[PDB]
Amino acid sequence: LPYPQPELPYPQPSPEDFVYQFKGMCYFTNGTERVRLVSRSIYNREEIVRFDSDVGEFRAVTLLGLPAAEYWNSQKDILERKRAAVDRVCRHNYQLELRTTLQRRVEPTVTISPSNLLVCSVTDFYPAQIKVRWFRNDQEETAGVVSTPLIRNGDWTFQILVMLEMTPQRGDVYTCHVEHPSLQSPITVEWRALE
Amino acid sequence: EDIVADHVASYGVNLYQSYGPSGQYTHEFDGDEQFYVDLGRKETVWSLPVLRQFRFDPQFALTNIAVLKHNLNSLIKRSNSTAATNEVPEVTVFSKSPVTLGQPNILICLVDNIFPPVVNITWLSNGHSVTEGVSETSFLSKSDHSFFKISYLTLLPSAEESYDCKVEHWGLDKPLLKHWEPELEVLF
Amino acid sequence: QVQLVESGGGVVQPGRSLRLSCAASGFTFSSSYWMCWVRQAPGQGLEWMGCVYGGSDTTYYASWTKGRFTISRDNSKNTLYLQMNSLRAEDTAVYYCARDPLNYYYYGELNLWGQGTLVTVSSASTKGPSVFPLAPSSTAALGCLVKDYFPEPVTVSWNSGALTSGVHTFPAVLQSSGLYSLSSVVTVPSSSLGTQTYICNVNHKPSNTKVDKKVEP
Amino acid sequence: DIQMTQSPSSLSASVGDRVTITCQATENIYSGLAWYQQKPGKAPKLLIYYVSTLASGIPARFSGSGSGTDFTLTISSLEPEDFAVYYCQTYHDISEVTFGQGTKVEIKRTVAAPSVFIFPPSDEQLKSGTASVVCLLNNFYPREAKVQWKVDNALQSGNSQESVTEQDSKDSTYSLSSTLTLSKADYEKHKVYACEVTHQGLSSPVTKSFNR
Ligand SMILES: *[C@@H]1O[C@H](CO)[C@@H](O)[C@H](O)[C@H]1NC(C)=O
Ligand SMILES: *[C@@H]1O[C@H](CO)[C@@H](O)[C@H](O)[C@H]1NC(C)=O
C-alpha cells in the first residue's frame, strides 16, 4: 500500500520540564542506492540510545541508554524488525517522495536593488540547489561580493540575497545571473546606474 | 559530526514533555515539515498540497506518543529527576520577498535554539496584538535536539506601520521584542 | 518457538466477574503489534473485543463492550489479561487472545493466537452425564446417550479407541434446564450383534466422571 | 463501527474448483483488509493481509483483490485441506476492528439416503422420572432433512431437540439426531411411538416406530 509509514519507538525497560524525543531518521545518497536509518531516543537534549542500520543493533550512547540497549538487543524479534525498517520505512517512503517532494520545482523571483551596495534578492525557490553570480559588463565579480546564508522560509521555499559593492560608472551594466534546477535557461537580470 | 547524504528525512519526529503534558508528531523531509498529526482531533494535517493525496493513520501518532509517555516517566526516575535546561532562543525577523509599498508581503519570524519546546510567538503592530494574518509552523527538529519555529504575518506595507515579534520563553528574564527593521539583518 | 498459552476459563455465575490469562512465550511484549482478545460463541463466527498496544497503555474496546471488559498486560509476568464484568448467557464463548499486527503489518506480519479457553455463563451446578443405552430392538446400528451434564465438553469413545469406523458423536445441545445432552452412534454389522461387546466410554473432565456402558439388545 | 458483510454464508465445491469468497465494507477501508482460515477445533490462521499480500508460507493458489468496499478471496484450484470457514477482517480503524460473518467451504459429493433408527427409552431412565426417545439418520447429503415425532399418531411440536455432525473426513456426509423428552407419567399414558423422516435421497418418506 502506498502511504507513508512510520519508524517506531520502543518501550524503555519558570516551570519544570522533562522532555523525551524519538527521531526515526533516514539518510539517502544516490537515491535508494545507499540508505541509512538512525533512530534516536533523546532525554531532554541528550541522546541516550540508538539504532543505526550501519551497526545493525541498539547501542547506548550514554549511561541512561544502557538499560534499553541491553533489553532491546535481548529481544530477537525487535532486532529483526529494526533491521528491516530501512526498507519498510526509509525505502518505502522514498518511493512516495520521488513522485511528490523530489519533483517540487519552484522557480525563483530574481530582483536587483540598491542598499554603493547592490542587492540581488533571489526569493521563493525549491529545491535548495542554487548558484548566484554577479557581473559588471560581462566581467565576473567575486572580490566585492557577500552572500547571505541560504534562508529557509518554512513554507517549502528558500531565499538568498547576494550583495555587490560597486564603483558606479556611466557606461556600466550590472547583471545578476541565477542558475536553478527548475529553470531551462539561467535567469539574467540587469541594473543600470542613473544619477 | 553530522552524517553526509543527498537527502535526510525524519519519518517520525516524536515529542512528548511533562509540561502540559503535550506531544507532537511530525514528518520532515530535507528540513521541511511534511505534515503534523493533531492529537486532540485524531487527524493528519498536511503542510504541502502534493502530499494531500496520501493517508497517515493518526493512530500511529497516538500510539507512539503513548510509548514516549512511558519512556519519559521511566527516564525521569532513572535520571534522578534531572530536568531540561532552559535555552535562550535566538530571534530573527525578515520578509518573504523584497519590500514594495503597494505590494503585499509576509513577515517571517524565526525563533531558533528553542528548548524546551514551549514558546509563545505573538505579533505587534505599533505596540498592539495582531490576530488576523497570523500563522506558524510546528516545532521543527535540530541535530542538537532543540527546535526552531517560524511565524508569519501577512500584511499590506506601510511607512508608518512598524512590526515587532514578541517571543516568550522560560530562558528569558523578560519577553523578547524583535523589531522588523529592513537594514540587512540577514546579510549582517 | 513462539506461542500464547491461555488459562482461567471455566464456569461463571450470571452477574459475576472473571479474569482470563494469556501468557506469552518465545517473545516479550513490545512495540509493532497489538495484543488483542477475540471471542467466538459455539457454532458462530469471530467477534473482536479489544486490543492493548504491545508497547504502551493504548487500549481500545469494541462499541458493544459498554465498559464491562478490561484489557491489561503485566510486563513483569509477560501476561495479557481479560477482566470480564457483569456476565450474561450472551457471553458464553471460546475466548482467544491474539498477537495481531493490525495497522503494523508493514513493520512485521507475525500473527499469533492462543489455543482458546471456554467460558460458560450459567448458575447451573457441576454434575456428570447419566449414560443410557441405545440398543437396537428386533446393516445395523447401536449407540450411547449422555444426558443432563454441566458444563461442556464430554469425550466419547467406542471399545476404548479400537472402534472408530462408523462412529458419529453428535454436537451437544443445551436443554431448557441449563444442562447438556448428546448421542454417539456406530454403524455395526448385523452378524456382529451378540458377537462383540460394544462399550461406550464417556468422560466428563469438569466433574471427573468416567462411565462405561455396554449393549444388551 | 465499519460493518463487514460476507458472501456467501456457506458454499459447496469439489477439488479443482475455482472458489471466490466476497467481503463488503460499509465504507472505504483503504487496504485495511485481512483474510483468515479457521478449521474445526483450531484458532484462525492468517492467509492474506493488506487486501492482497500473501502471508508467509501460504500457498500460491490463494489470492486477494478489491478496493474501497468490495473485496474477494480467490482459491484458484481447490485442495482437500481448503475445506474450512473463511473470514475477512478490517483493521482500517484499529479502535473498532470487525470480522465478516464467515463462509464455510464444503465438499460436493453425490446424494445419499439416510439410514433411520428409533431408540426406545431405557428402563433405567424411567426409574428416575423422565423418558427419552431418540431418532437417528445416518450418512446423508445434503443437510436438509425433516423429522417429526408422533405419540399415538398425534404430531409433536416443541418436543424435539435435533443435532448434526459435520461433513465426515471420510464420506463427507452428515447425521441428524432428533430427541423427544417427556415425563414417565405421560410416557406410560400412551403406546405407539413413531418417527417419520423426509429426505431428497429417498423416493418417498421413510418411517420407523416401536410399541410401548
Ligand atoms: C549511483 O547509482 C548507480 C546505479 O543506479 C550506481 O551504479 C553508482 O555507483 C552510483 N553513481 C554515483 C555517481 O555515485
Ligand atoms: C505563554 O502564554 C501563556 C498564556 O498567555 C502564559 O500563561 C505563559 O506563561 C506563557 N509562556 C511563557 C514561557 O512565558
GROMACS .gro file of C-alpha atoms in nm, chain B residues 5 61 81 88 106 110 140 151 158:
model
    9
  200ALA     CA    1   2.382   1.230   0.247
  256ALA     CA    2   0.099   0.926   1.628
  276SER     CA    3   1.458   1.370   3.819
  283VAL     CA    4   1.789   3.128   2.537
  301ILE     CA    5   0.470   3.823   0.451
  305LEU     CA    6   1.224   3.266   1.303
  335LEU     CA    7   1.097   2.165   1.376
  346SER     CA    8   0.565   3.253   1.250
  353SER     CA    9   0.310   5.099   0.523
   0.00000   0.00000   0.00000
